[PDB]
Amino acid sequence: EKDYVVIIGSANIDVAGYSHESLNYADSNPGKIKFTPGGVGRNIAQNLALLGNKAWLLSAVGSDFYGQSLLTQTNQSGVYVDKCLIVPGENTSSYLSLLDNTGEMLVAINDMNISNAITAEYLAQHREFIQRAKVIVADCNISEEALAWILDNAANVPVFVDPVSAWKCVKVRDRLNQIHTLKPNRLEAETLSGIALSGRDDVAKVAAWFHQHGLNRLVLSMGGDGVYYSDIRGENGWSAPAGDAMMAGLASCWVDGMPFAESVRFAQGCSS
Numbered sequence: 001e002k003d004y005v006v007i008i009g010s011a012n013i014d015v016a017g018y019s020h021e022s023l024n025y026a027d028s029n030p031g032k033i034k035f036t037p038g039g040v041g042r043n044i045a046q047n048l049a050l051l052g053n054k055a056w057l058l059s060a061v062g063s064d065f066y067g068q069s070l071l072t073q074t075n076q077s078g079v080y081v082d083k084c085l086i087v088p089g090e091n092t093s094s095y096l097s098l099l100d101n102t103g104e105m106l107v108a109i110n111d112m113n114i115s116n117a118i119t120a121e122y123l124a125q126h127r128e129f130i131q132r133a134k135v136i137v138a139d140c141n142i143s144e145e146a147l148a149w150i151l152d153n154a155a156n157v158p159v160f161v162d163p164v165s166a167w168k169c170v171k172v173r174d175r176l177n178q179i180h181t182l183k184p185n186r187l188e189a190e191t192l193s194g195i196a197l198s199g200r201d202d203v204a205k206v207a208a209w210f211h212q213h214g215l216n217r218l219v220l221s222m223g224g225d226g227v228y229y230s231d232i233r234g235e236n237g238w239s240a241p242a243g244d245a246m247m248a249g250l251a252s253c254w255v256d257g258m259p260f261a262e263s264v265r266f267a268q269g270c271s272s
């Protein structure tokens, strides 16, 4: 009732554009362009609202009008955007996307320096508020310094961390002992551990590596091989019967009181 989840991460305007016919690289080739709310953190925040939790986004948008519409749009979806930064005169984050007639991803551009405005100084302004959430979800779009501040100031509140990409995930390597649940895919787990994840035969040693480095819980998506989960206390298994629904799933199930393995399976069904 007074239980709420806090999400710290980025909010993007996803722009998806594709031509209707073969792309003439000359003049305005008619097509269909879709604007979309995005960012890993903002997406997880929205999914938690849909799941029935009181979700607070801690993010940054620019004063660029389309920033304020991102906030409003996610607000309508349930999220308490009341606390975000509106950054004066910055481009709000966005994730440009160029699809094909087959929805085939051609090129993708990413403008997210505003993500760096989610500072420790900003987060410290809500130290009390953040320290009273039932759980904190952070993505690795924010700076090393900011994520360091979250992990250092969670006041025993569990931090679920979404690694976002192989490039952005590394900022957590030295801080796995502060992360309650980490959700890497194959490449991100390879990148973090330095151990090749060639197939199911290798997850045992990867997970063992994560735990040696203090990770409480690993939820490792192996794509087609399904999901491997591993608790430092010993419980591991496979669920082998999107990632933004997965993270929301895991965090919501935790707050709901659900055991680890049952949460992985549930979140994996929120994913599909």
Ligand SMILES: O=c1[nH]cc([C@@H]2O[C@H](CO)[C@@H](O)[C@H]2O)c(=O)[nH]1
Residues within 6 Å of the ligand: 010, 012, 013, 014, 037, 038, 039, 040, 041, 043, 094, 095, 110, 141, 164, 165, 168, 242, 243, 244
């Ligand atoms: O580096 C990043 N790329 C893409 C995203 C966002 O993730 C979403 C897809 O899961 C999408 O909305 C994009 O903006 C991000 O947060 N960081």
